[PDB]
């Protein structure tokens, strides 16, 4: 849809603080902090796939909207994730150990904008088409 494509990270605000709030250790925060990943979003039938590709770490999820799935995150959390579409925004929640974090992906002008919340920390990451 509006999301399908190959997206390159161009700006990031508060990602270190977001990772720290998640409990991510120094080494993984070091990898994450200056990484400029590609995000590759595709759809086939009911199934959306999101690939996150970067020099030191790649991840991938495939899911059906509204159907919970197990995910191993880039920081090695074992979480239960659910993704839905709410007013054109792809809203992902990850739940683990009584905690949750939300990752919202929206299209704004030429941008894929990703808002990441953990407790009182809000990170915003902006991608543009490769
Ligand atoms: C947590 C966590 N811990 O590490 C990483 C991580 C990435 N997280 C995201 O990009 C996602 C998922 C988190 C919100 C931003 C998202 C997005 O913008 O799509 S990219 C990357 C790393 C660590 C290794 C180097 C490359 N997330």
UniProtKB/Swiss-Prot annotation:
Domain of life: Eukaryota
Residues binding a fatty acid: 125-127
GO CC terms of this entry: cytoplasm; cytosol; extracellular exosome; lipid droplet; nucleus
CDD domains from the UniProt entry: FABP4
Positions of modified residues (Phosphoserine): 11
Biological process, per Gene Ontology: brown fat cell differentiation; cellular response to lithium ion; cellular response to tumor necrosis factor; cholesterol homeostasis; fatty acid transport; long-chain fatty acid transport; negative regulation of DNA-templated transcription; positive regulation of cold-induced thermogenesis
Transmembrane segments: none
Disulfide bonds: none
Complex formation: Monomer. Homodimer. Interacts with PPARG.
Family from the record: Belongs to the calycin superfamily. Fatty-acid binding protein (FABP) family.
Protein name: Fatty acid-binding protein, adipocyte
Taxonomic lineage from the root: Eukaryota, Metazoa, Chordata, Craniata, Vertebrata
